[PDB]
Design a protein around this ligand. Sequence first.
Ligand SMILES: [Zn+2]
Ligand SMILES: [Zn+2]
Ligand SMILES: [Zn+2]
Ligand SMILES: [Zn+2]
Lengths: 351, 66, 348, 460, 284
Amino acid sequence: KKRTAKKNITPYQRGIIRSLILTLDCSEAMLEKDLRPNRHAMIIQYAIDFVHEFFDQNPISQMGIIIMRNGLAQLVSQVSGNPQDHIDALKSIRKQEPKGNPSLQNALEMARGLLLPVPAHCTREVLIVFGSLSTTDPGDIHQTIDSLVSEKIRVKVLGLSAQVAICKELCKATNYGDESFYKILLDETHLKELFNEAVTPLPVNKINKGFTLVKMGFPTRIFEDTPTFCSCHSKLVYGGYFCPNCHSKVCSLPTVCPCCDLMLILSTHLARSYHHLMPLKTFAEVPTTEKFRSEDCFSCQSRFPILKNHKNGKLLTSSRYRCEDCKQEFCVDCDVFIHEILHNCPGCESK
Amino acid sequence: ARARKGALVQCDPSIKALILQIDAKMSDIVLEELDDTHLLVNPSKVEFVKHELNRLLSKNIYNPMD
Amino acid sequence: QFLQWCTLQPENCAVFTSDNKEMFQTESGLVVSTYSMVANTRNRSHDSQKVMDFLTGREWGFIILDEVHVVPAAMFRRVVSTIAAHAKLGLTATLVREDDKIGDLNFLIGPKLYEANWMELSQKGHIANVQCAEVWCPMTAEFYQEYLRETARKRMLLYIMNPTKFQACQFLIQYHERRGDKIIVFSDNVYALQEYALKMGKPFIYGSTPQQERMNILQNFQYNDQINTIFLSKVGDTSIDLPEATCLIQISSHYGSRRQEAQRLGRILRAKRRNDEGFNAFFYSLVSKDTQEMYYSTKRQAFLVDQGYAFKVITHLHGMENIPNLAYASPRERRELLQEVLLKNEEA
Amino acid sequence: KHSVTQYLEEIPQQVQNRLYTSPATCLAIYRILPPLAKFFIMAMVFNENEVPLLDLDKWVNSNGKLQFQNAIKSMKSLHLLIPNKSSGTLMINLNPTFKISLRNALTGGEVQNSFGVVVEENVVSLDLLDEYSANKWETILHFMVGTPLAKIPSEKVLNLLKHSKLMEEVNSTGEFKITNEGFQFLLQEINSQLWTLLLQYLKMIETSKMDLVDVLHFIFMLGALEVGKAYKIDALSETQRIMLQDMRDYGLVFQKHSNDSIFYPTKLALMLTSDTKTIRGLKNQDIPDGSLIVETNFKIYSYSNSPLQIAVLSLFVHLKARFVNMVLGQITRESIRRALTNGITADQIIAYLETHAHPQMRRLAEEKLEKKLELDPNCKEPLQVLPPTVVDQIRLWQLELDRVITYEGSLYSDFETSQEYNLLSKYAQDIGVLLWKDDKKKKFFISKEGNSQVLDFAKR
Amino acid sequence: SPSLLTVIIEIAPKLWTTFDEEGNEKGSIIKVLEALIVFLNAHLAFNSANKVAVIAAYSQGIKYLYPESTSALDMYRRFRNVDETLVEEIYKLFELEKKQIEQNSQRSTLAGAMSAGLTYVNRISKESVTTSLKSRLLVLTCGSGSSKDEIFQYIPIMNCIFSATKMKCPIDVVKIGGSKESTFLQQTTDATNGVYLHVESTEGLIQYLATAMFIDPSLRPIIVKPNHGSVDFRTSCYLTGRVVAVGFICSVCLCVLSIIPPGNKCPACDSQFDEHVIAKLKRK
DNA sequence: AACACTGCGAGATA
DNA sequence: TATCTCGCAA
Ligand SMILES: [Zn+2]
Ligand SMILES: [Zn+2]
Ligand SMILES: [Zn+2]
Ligand SMILES: [Zn+2]
């Protein structure tokens, strides 16, 4: 009795840069009573969580937020790389209440307009949190979908408790045909993990596309305190960074230089990327009676191994889920922790 | 360093006047009367001030609770 | 209040009183009657007797009853035997009633089918959240020693007439107009009511007021927005309850009838229904300290805890010190109010 | 709380050093000081040279200077140090006996006292005689509060309670009832109760054959750690041995039978200083046995129970019929008016409920808690973590019975100009320390924080 | 507020000899060991009985010291047990030394040490949900020569950093050796809100330790004691080896390359580039 | 192109 | 069980 992914078969490519434009759904449907406060409040709360998470794991991307009220798509946060703006925008929205019908077509068109400036190496995306069971379009939709797939704009949507044919067509269409991206939910926890899996970059099997070197430079922190002075918000700020080339102060960020317009990063962002590129082989669960290995943990020192012949208890299993390449044991907690938070396998590091 | 300690009392002026009456009845322990809304007292006798206040309020009102 | 809003046409439902002579033994359709007329010592005219004779003549297939617990079941059983009806109905109000005698009115009429589950009713949206509050206004040393020297009713005239009560009333009046909420004040005293209704410029409905002036204020309250603070005695609350005004202020309160004030205050909150998102129905009570009325007002709030309504205490709202329009705030006006109250105690 | 630390600083300096001769006592009192003082002392202990105060000021930054004063005032009051106006400056250094004793304790000193313990066959079982100590503590608690039958035979303990006036009971008639002292005894759960009793034994046992240095040596040696072997036999003064026997009678010593053996280290002495878990014929399993009742409906719902605990609850609520898991009781204004008759303030009971009766209110305090502190800045409305409704009702009953308002601080003057008074008032409003002020009188009665900050700004 | 100070002392007998080689052989690690014992006792006393832990890094692996994995199956005297157990374990470890131990000098398992220690911190925090442990680890390293900057451990160190920041665990480091600022460690302490201390060899650290390695438990109103600036002009070019400022980073490879593009197939991932893009870069 | 006007039972009451 | 209110009828 195990619930594990068999194997990862695109551990070669992902979209590391991103520009994901999450589009919420604020329309009369979202006011029904299936999720604890409503659909809407729970949705926005989880949206905040996802914003934090996504801007953590992909700390070089941008993001924009879009609502769908009264059949209109009203941008509530410009595509920007500072999480706090989007966070505040969502805060503001959550106190406002939905109306009108969701105009999927308008939101789609607004996005396609929005992502034009994003350069070729950056990758586009949208994430429709579609909640209702209808749309209300002021135009042909398949027209838009065709324009989309022409502009190389992958789309993933998370329907609420139903399946809508057009959305299924939409996901199947933009994502190079390979349909896996219209996942819809059946529980709140399912919803949390839905957003979580939306956080990561997105491979399926990438067509051979243009791969391009991108100019960027790293800043150096500043020293003085009273000389507070800023060139990205025109304030007094007690000390920040210096563009190596533009050579002007910039308040703390991985932002783009507001003088000479080149990307700024430290490295730790690149480190996050590295973590996403080449993950580990999924740790194997050791055979119950065939292990005969050390009775402890390895990374930690846990005493949860077996019980040695106990009718049904020992017949159950032997908590020895052990990674492959280092071939050392690890208790369940250690394996969960390694594969979730820190991806340097303890033993596999040491040799 | 100037700090004049004591039992500071603040209430409505009517209750302040009643407290001054009671205090004079019990030999004027009030150290100072800062204003119409504040009083400076020695904390030594404030407890029996409250006791006699309770006694007189029980005498007067008697709490019919009808 | 309802039967014309309801489908009922009162053309057939002749109302009999033994004083409100109406068409008996000729009503083509259903009738509406009362226990006092149907069977009681209040058979002032033989109209009630003729109504009962007609009731015997026609086998009334059904009977509608409202609050029979108050009327003893003896008259009910007498008319049950007299009329020999086909069916009846009991629209009860209390789980236990004085008419639970050996012959229960249930088996006289029928079994129970529904219970007025007030926890199911009083929480889904009608009352709009009762917020029971009591403004603890201060009192004065000149009225307290004159309060203790008076007893046997002529002592409530010093309690109600307080200078800080006008500072708490004109502050809550100006506070509710800034939020756009109408005010429906209540009271008990007759005189003390006209003195607080004439100075604030708030039309009044009181005892023995002509109905041509009574309905004109209701046309200036339900249509005109300039009258958001009305002053009603005991006639304008037991006759018509207004579903507006989400802010209620109680000033004059009588002892004993604290449950009758609870029946009056409950009928206003039940009339105010529209299921709003906020719908905050504020209730205030200007109770002066160390007076015999605030200790009886705690029995009134104790009945509201029995209904499930939440009660909070508000000593003073931080805003009454910034209102220059509060009458009797200056000590000169407090001494002028003292002389007006000392003349009122000399007249009563 | 008499705040035994205050009693510690009460004693004169020479006897303070007398105590400091005992390294274990030095360690135990190190445990008590505020963290700021703890850190500063640990700094000074090693560099064998006085240090100017200016450094110890510049060590601390803004928004935390209040603790600097707390620490320095405390340490000076108990005179662990010696301020030195050597060159007109401040050459701080500890009472050197304290320094040397502490340093010895940190790296194998000669504290034969603290090392008085003996290692041997500690045949003492966890429940073994631990249940007996718990039973003795319960018996004395019941006898002092007054149970249906008080088997409390502590003639010395009874004398201490009476002469100490432990509880408002007519000891002349044998009454052991709750007075203001009795109310406090009902209030101080474990550390408070043990502390009050220790202070009472101190005050009563203060006449002859005291040897206060040996007294505290024995007390702290008990609280330090399990001496076990040879404790009662060897490691005790003569009067120390007598005091140890008395404490063992008082429960605070879990000495074995045979009247001659090593020290019996009961958990209670640990409880004296630990400020930790409180749980102690041969049956007694309960991490949450105490099943009290306290919700928003002001009712008493009890499943878990403890007879003395539920009696404590009854000390402010009515009892009609004891049930299997419940006891007939409903908390009202009358219920607390019972304790108000004893004049018991609705203050200790607050934190008591917040802490005690929680063995049955764990989930209640968790759902009220809801971690609504990190969520407080975002969701501006608290989720009744500490129930304010109950607090308001209690305050209303207290107000109904009281009618008097008082303020702390001290009167202030020498506000020569209106500018200084106005600027200080503005700064106080910024820091929220001004209870009330008026420029016409140039006086007010508030906390000393504004004057402290202004004086520090002026002088340095 | 209890704290779990989990020292991580690395002991390379190669680096131990270097310490003997450095300056004079006027004292082996024994000084460091004793000072560490004392500091550990100090922390063990400071708080309300808050646990500790210690890990090592010998030439051919790592092994715990204090928590003392199941083996059988004075002064407060708990100090006694901790210290005597640690010293028994460390002498046992010193028995674990020979030529086959001298063989696998290729690596330096410090990164494994930090990673495992972090896992330990997570274990303890997770088990002790009640009374949340404001934990924080340490690092003691004997700075030796023969490698100006070993880099094959660069990534796992940074993964340690990120784990630390997420887990909210300051990590302080004390390097004892030549005047070579351990760049990765320097960034580790600076980023994870730590403190760096590049002592000289033979001084009895205990003062350094108890001063600047004791203010990180759960205080943070206090100025840390870090050395001169912590420039984040990061890794030198993979191809070149000279520290880069205006970087030139390929792609999905992510390697940082100098101003010298090989024109194709960045020399860490086989990815030929658009020669048009190459010219666009060359447009300067 | 003139009848009077007050008694009397409901609920509630300390 | 004594006491008001107060609608109520004409
Ligand atoms: Zn800026
Ligand atoms: Zn620039
Ligand atoms: Zn493990
Ligand atoms: Zn591995």
